Amino acid sequence: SYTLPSLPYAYDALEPHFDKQTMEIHHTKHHQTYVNNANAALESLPEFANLPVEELITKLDQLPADKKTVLRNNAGGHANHSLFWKGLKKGTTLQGDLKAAIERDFGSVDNFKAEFEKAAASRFGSGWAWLVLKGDKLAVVSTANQDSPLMGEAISGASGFPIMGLDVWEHAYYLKFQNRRPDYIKEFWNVVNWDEAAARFAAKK
């Protein structure tokens, strides 16, 4: 069965950038609910119930048609938030191979940040902004709702291995930022965990 993962830090660990009230609600209510809904949907499907969630979401086309959507949404949500929590940490520095890759692919760190900010800002409605690796190269893309690039292009409109991502559902920012998503996106730069992104970049799948 899926379970809500413990966070790697306290709910106030990302202050003063992401707010503690949101962190706590986002984890204990939003994320918990994706877990609960996915488990409920997987009760009747013992062949799928047991796989890591990162695997289940690559196999959505194999599910019964009447289970496709509920698991796309909820196993997607469980996958994405699990990555998100581990992908946030204060005090990290972009450096090494990842940094060199960003500069190579976007020309500069500032162009990369610009391109991610725009992708994050223009995702209309609920969704995610991602840094993804595919074919030796970095790119920035966004997905709808809880879709992940790991689900493939047919389903998500995106593809590749996520290196890092930012939740742009309004629940992730409305308490402190209201409508000002670009402010929330700039604050992300203060808390994106570059050590974990590097580790994913080395691993590459």
Number of residues that bind Mn ion (CB under 5 A): 3
Residues numbered 172-201 forming contacts with Mn ion, rule: CB under 5 A: 172
Q: Which is nearer to a copy of itself, 169 or 201 (CB)?
A: 169
- Partner interacting with residue 167 (select from a copy of itself, Mn ion, none; CB below 5-8 Å by kind): Mn ion
Distance CA 167, CA 113 (A): 16
Residues numbered 138-197 forming contacts with a copy of itself, rule: CB under 8 A: 144-146, 169-171, 174-175, 178-179
Select from 104-112, 120-128, 182-190, 191-199 the region that touches a copy of itself (CB under 8 A): 120-128
CB of 38 to a copy of itself, least distance (A): 13
Whole-number Cα distances in Å, 52 to 80, 143, 194: 13, 21, 24
CA–chain centroid gap for 95, Å, is: 21
Closest CA to 168 of 192, 151, 144: 144
Terminal Cα-to-Cα distance of the chain (whole angstroms): 24
Residue reference for tokens 């990369």: 112
Distance CA 38, CA 121 (A): 29
- Partner interacting with residue 187 (select from a copy of itself, Mn ion, none; CB below 5-8 Å by kind): none
81 known ligand binder: yes
- Partner interacting with residue 143 (select from Mn ion, a copy of itself, none; CB below 5-8 Å by kind): none
In this structure, what token pair is assigned to residue 62?
């194999």
19 binds Mn ion (CB under 5 A): no
167 binds Mn ion (CB under 5 A): yes
For a copy of itself, which residue of 9, 15, 29, 189 counts as binding (CB under 8 A)? 29
Distance CA 147, CA 156 (A): 5
Q: Which is nearer to a copy of itself, 60 or 198 (CB)?
A: 60
Q: Report which secondary-structure segment, H or E, holds 104.
A: helix 96-106
Distance CA 161, CA 131 (A): 8
Q: Report which secondary-structure segment, H or E, holds 22.
A: helix 20-25
Q: Which is nearer to a copy of itself, 24 or 54 (CB)?
A: 24
In this structure, what token pair is assigned to residue 198?
């590097």
Task: Please give the annotated binding residues, written as ranges.
Answer: 26, 81, 167, 171
Interface residues with a copy of itself (CB under 8 A) are 25, 29-30, 33, 73, 124-127, 144-146, 169-171, 174-175, 178-179
Interface residues with Mn ion (CB under 5 A) are 167, 169, 172
